[PDB]
Amino acid sequence: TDLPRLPFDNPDIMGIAPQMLALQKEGPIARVGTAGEDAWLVTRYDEVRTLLADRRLRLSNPNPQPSAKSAARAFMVALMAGDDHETEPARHAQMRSLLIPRFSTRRLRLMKTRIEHHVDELLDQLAASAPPVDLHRVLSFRLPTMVVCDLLGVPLADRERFGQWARGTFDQSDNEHSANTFQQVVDYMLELVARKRVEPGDDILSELIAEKDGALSDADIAHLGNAVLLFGYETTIVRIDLGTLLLLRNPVQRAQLAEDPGLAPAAVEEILRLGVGGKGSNALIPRYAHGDITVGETVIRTGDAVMLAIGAANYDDRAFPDGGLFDLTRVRPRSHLAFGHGARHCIGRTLARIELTAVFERLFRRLPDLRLAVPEESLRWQEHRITGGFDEIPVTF
Numbered sequence: 001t002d003l004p005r006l007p008f009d010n011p012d013i014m015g016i017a018p019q020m021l022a023l024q025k026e027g028p029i030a031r032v033g034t035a036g037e038d039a040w041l042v043t044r045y046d047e048v049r050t051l052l053a054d055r056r057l058r059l060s061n062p063n064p065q066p067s068a069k070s071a072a073r074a075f076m077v078a079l080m081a082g083d084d085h086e087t088e089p090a091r092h093a094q095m096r097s098l099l100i101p102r103f104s105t106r107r108l109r110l111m112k113t114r115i116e117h118h119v120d121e122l123l124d125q126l127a128a129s130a131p132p133v134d135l136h137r138v139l140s141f142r143l144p145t146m147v148v149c150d151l152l153g154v155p156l157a158d159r160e161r162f163g164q165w166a167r168g169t170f171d172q173s174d175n176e177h178s179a180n181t182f183q184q185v186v187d188y189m190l191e192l193v194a195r196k197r198v199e200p201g202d203d204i205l206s207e208l209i210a211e212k213d214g215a216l217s218d219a220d221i222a223h224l225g226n227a228v229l230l231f232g233y234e235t236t237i238v239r240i241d242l243g244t245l246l247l248l249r250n251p252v253q254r255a256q257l258a259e260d261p262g263l264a265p266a267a268v269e270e271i272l273r274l275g276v277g278g279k280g281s282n283a284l285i286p287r288y289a290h291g292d293i294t295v296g297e298t299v300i301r302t303g304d305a306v307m308l309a310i311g312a313a314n315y316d317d318r319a320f321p322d323g324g325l326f327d328l329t330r331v332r333p334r335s336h337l338a339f340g341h342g343a344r345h346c347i348g349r350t351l352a353r354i355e356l357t358a359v360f361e362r363l364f365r366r367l368p369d370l371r372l373a374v375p376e377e378s379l380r381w382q383e384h385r386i387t388g389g390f391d392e393i394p395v396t397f
Ligand code: HEM
Pocket: 059, 080, 096, 099, 227, 228, 231, 232, 233, 235, 236, 239, 285, 286, 337, 338, 339, 340, 341, 343, 344, 345, 346, 347, 348, 349, 351, 352, 353
């Protein structure tokens, strides 16, 4: 008997840690240690999907004496209206009600067109430069921050102001840096709300200001704006990097995609399914039990912490035959869990798919000789950030 301890080592830069796959083979749920409190780790697709849809499992901590969290995790939980278990039901419901209609079909159609032109322009600059080039800086970073500038109705140069703020806010290693960066986000967003009240446009904060019919406070609106800024670009950047790395590892599929850009939607779903980096701590969705829940023969008791391993579940052979293989020819693959599922299903997921599809429609057709300019093992997944990610991706072409 040796209690497994998260986070598990991964000898590769991508994929699932061997110990987590080992637990997955043994069964759906295991008690594990963590850096903080012990938790139930759930690793099989069926049980992770079921529990994500179970209303007894929530983000908020119901415990009287809550275990201390990093400033970074506290900020993330508060941006998600999970900081107070007694008000989470009403506050979370309001959050989703106010954010979901900010991603209308009308907006997403307009944004898809702008996104596609912008990727064309980004790749033209890339193709004209002299390798080695940092694909992370000049492509992966630039498209999702472009998109957030569009959503917020701010000049594109603003992303040079806010482009490191999700990383700094979600830096679990430095509480002081996390809090100081979050204060910058807050100040910026409160300035933006004040401007949009006299100079509105076709953008998210202007719509929230107009909502029913001006009843939201500036602080309420800025809180929603902060969630869009802090969840709305960094994770997408990470998936562009991961998708590039995965396609570089699979030259037959990459050549298929270069020949037929109509495979890009399929490629994007495989990228989301398989795109897990380093120790994959961001692919563990945290929850607390607000009532007793039975999983197989294991009883999760009220108050227990649960880690839902969406990454491991997306690799589950029970759900995806040859679960570790990248295959954009999969016929009717199950819906992956990389955007979550249930009450907190990612609000931006349709927009994120539009971004990834536009990139991977184009990338290897425009740059067919694209390849890493450094060994894979030199790429450093940033474990201390809640969102993970690589800091650079050197390429030649
Ligand atoms: C490939 C890109 C993305 C991935 C993989 C991703 C992933 C996720 C996941 C897994 C969750 C659920 C967390 C949980 O259940 O505790 C989530 C929540 C959320 N995401 Fe995304 N996300 C992406 C892009 C975006 C974008 C572009 C936006 C908006 C512009 C966005 C906005 C949100 C919001 C507001 C939430 C909170 C939902 C809630 O708590 O009800 N995300 N995201």
